[PDB]
Amino acid sequence: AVQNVADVSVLQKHLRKLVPLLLEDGGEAPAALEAALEEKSALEQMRKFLSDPQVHTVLVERSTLKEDVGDEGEEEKEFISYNINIDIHYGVKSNSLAFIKRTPVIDADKPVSSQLRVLTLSEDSPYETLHSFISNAVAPFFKSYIRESGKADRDGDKMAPSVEKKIAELEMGLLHLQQNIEIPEISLPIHPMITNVAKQCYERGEKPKVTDFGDKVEDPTFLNQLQSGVNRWIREIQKVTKLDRDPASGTALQEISFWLNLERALYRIQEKRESPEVLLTLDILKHGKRFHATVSFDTDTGLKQALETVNDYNPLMKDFPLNDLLSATELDKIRQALVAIFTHLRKIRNTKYPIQRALRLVEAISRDLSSQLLKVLGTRKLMHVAYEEFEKVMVACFEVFQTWDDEYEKLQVLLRDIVKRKREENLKMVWRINPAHRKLQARLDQMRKFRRQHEQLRAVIVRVLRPQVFDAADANAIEEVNLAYENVKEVDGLDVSKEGTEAWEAAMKRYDERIDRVETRITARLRDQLGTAKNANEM
């Protein structure tokens, strides 16, 4: 509710004590914080924050500013810059503190931190952070109330279990969290003086030496700064390497395009000294008692084993049969493209590509198969597809169906040949692809029944419902069957969801109400015309 407005001093001192540890493991309320923290621009901001019972968001940040300095001697300088915001956003190169008022107006007489909750910002990956931390903060925790509060005991309100289910839907639905940010590399985040000095030591073209750095070649803090810079450089490049795309946050197409880009970039991360300036950087690290940074440019940042980890360079040639399948629009092209990707799977086994991952990629590719045959179905115009044309193109798409099953049982032959491969490698079995394709076919084939069904009626109706082939009723009854085919057509078409099949079921139950009326008529005419004898027109 609305209460006394707190004063700046108490919360200012509280946040001043809280920040420096949370920011740089210490600092004891640095003066840069207090400079603009006491500033009227921020002061009136927190005054409005405390007073207004409508704003409950705030952002206090302290960017370790990377001040670019043009003076010769170095590249950059570390800086401190406190920032104040009333709206919250991702601060760049900095972690921030947000404060949410649990009470719309906060006072000092009650504990401020009791009526206000603290959030601390992540700069490395804010989205992954917020997701994982909300999960590990609420899921078993809302679960603890789901059990303790007896929400299962009182069934009058069953919306808390549903909100638990939707929290789970979030937590297991987005796990990539916009993964694979496509970071290829970073700059040289090491000691600036050494880099600059080597730069003028080689722009002369005279092979930067040990002595040209002077006493700095043996100065301990200088050398340790070099070490820390090289360590952070290997941190971000091992970051760009550990990016291991999964089929989600994209698709299997995008997964193996990730393999493309990853491999063509780790071709150059095999070492990191390729640039002549970075060659002499290697040389000066060797000179400047950082020869482990040199071998890093050879081994650690010289990430050669990435290639050994990703010897899977035959997926590069897999991208071509997959592309053939992508362009495969005509049914025959689709089947032969499945054959082509299958044969190059026979080829791709040579590399140690993760078969669980690989054939889950083919799972995604199989749902992509469903999508492309859905495009072909839209070409077929399932909404108002013409009956006999429709069963002919069902002959076509069903020979395509048992043919997808032909090279799918061939994918089981691939499972056998990968039994051979696991005899040479072994790996986890879980590589399901099992598509939703049949479901479409299921709907397809069940509709086909309907199709044949009415064709079993209509043509035969053209004679059987006709008297001795009753005029007044049966004219409108042949209309009944035909316009009922229209009514099942006008409501059931290319509807992808199974609700289309359900409306199809309703359509046939009313259709077959009419059809059973026709059966009653024809059996009535039968029995009233019987009783004569067995021969021909009689029986």
8 binds a copy of itself (CB under 8 A): no
Residue span binding a copy of itself (CB under 8 A) among the ranges 164-172, 363-371, 377-385, 494-502: 164-172
Q: Minimum Å distance from CB 286 to a copy of itself?
A: 25
Exposure on the CB side of residue 202, measured as CA atoms within 13 A? 19
Residue span binding a copy of itself (CB under 8 A) among the ranges 38-46, 120-128, 517-525, 531-539: 120-128
Q: How far apart are the C-alpha atoms of 410 and 140, rounded to whole Å?
A: 45
Which of 404, 393, 408 lies closest to 334 in space, CA to CA?
404
Q: Please list, in sequence order, all residues whose beta carbon lies within 8 angstroms of the beta carbon of residue 483, skipping any fewer than 6 positions away.
A: none
CB 304 within 8 A of CB 295: no
Q: Minimum Å distance from CB 169 to a copy of itself?
A: 7
Q: How far apart are the C-alpha atoms of 177 and 129, rounded to whole Å?
A: 9
Q: Could you give the string, one character per residue 393-432, with x where binding to a copy of itself holds by CB under 8 A and - elsewhere?
A: ----------------------------------------
Residue span binding a copy of itself (CB under 8 A) among the ranges 43-51, 143-151, 374-382, 430-438: 143-151
67 binds a copy of itself (CB under 8 A): no
136 binds a copy of itself (CB under 8 A): yes
Which of 400, 410, 394 lies closest to 362 in space, CA to CA?
410
12 binds a copy of itself (CB under 8 A): no
Q: Is residue 246 exposed (0-12), middle (13-18) or buried (19+ Cβ within 10 Å)?
A: middle
Q: Minimum Å distance from CB 418 to a copy of itself?
A: 31
Residue span binding a copy of itself (CB under 8 A) among the ranges 248-256, 293-301, 371-379, 515-523: 248-256
> Which position among 173, 274, 350, 520 is part of the footprint of a copy of itself (CB under 8 A)?
173
Within residues 76-115, the interface with a copy of itself by CB under 8 A covers 80, 87-90, 92, 95, 97-98, 100, 102-109, 111-114
Q: Which is nearer to a copy of itself, 98 or 326 (CB)?
A: 98
> Which position among 83, 225, 254, 487 is part of the footprint of a copy of itself (CB under 8 A)?
254
Q: Which is nearer to a copy of itself, 126 or 493 (CB)?
A: 126
Within residues 456-485, the interface with a copy of itself by CB under 8 A covers none
User: Residue count at the site for a copy of itself (CB under 8 A)?
Assistant: 94
Q: Minimum Å distance from CB 77 to a copy of itself?
A: 21
Q: Minimum Å distance from CB 34 to a copy of itself?
A: 17
Instruction: At 325, list the tokens.
Output: 């399948």
Three-state secondary structure call for residue 371: helix
> Which position among 177, 483, 494, 503 is part of the footprint of a copy of itself (CB under 8 A)?
177
Q: Is the dihedral of CA 34, 40, 42, 43 positive or negative?
A: positive
Q: In this structure, what is the dihedral angle of CA atoms 6, 10, 15, 16, given to the nearest 10 degrees?
A: 150
Q: Minimum Å distance from CB 240 to a copy of itself?
A: 16
Name the helix (H) or strand (E) containing 66: strand 66-68
Q: Minimum Å distance from CB 477 to a copy of itself?
A: 49
> Which position among 169, 185, 218, 516 is part of the footprint of a copy of itself (CB under 8 A)?
169
137 binds a copy of itself (CB under 8 A): yes
243 binds a copy of itself (CB under 8 A): no
Q: How far is CA 421 from CA 156, 197, 264, 350, 530, in A?
A: 57, 54, 26, 9, 72
Q: Could you give the string, one character per residue 18-47, with x where binding to a copy of itself holds by CB under 8 A and - elsewhere?
A: xx-xxxxxx---x-----------------
64 binds a copy of itself (CB under 8 A): no
391 binds a copy of itself (CB under 8 A): no
Q: How far apart are the C-alpha atoms of 502 and 506, rounded to whole Å?
A: 6
Q: How far apart are the C-alpha atoms of 468 and 480, rounded to whole Å?
A: 19
Contacts 24+ apart (CB under 8 A), 438-446: 438/401, 439/498, 440/370, 440/373, 440/374, 440/377, 440/496, 441/397, 441/398, 441/401, 443/498, 443/500, 443/501, 443/504, 444/394, 444/397, 444/398, 444/401, 445/394, 445/398, 446/501, 446/504
178 binds a copy of itself (CB under 8 A): yes
160 binds a copy of itself (CB under 8 A): yes
Which of 177, 101, 94 lies closest to 135 in space, CA to CA?
177
Residue span binding a copy of itself (CB under 8 A) among the ranges 7-15, 33-41, 308-316, 527-535: 7-15
Q: How many residues does the chain have?
A: 539
Three-state secondary structure call for residue 81: strand
Q: How far apart are the C-alpha atoms of 481 and 52, rounded to whole Å?
A: 70
Q: Minimum Å distance from CB 84 to a copy of itself?
A: 11
Torsion angles phi and psi, residue 482, rounded to 5: -70, -50
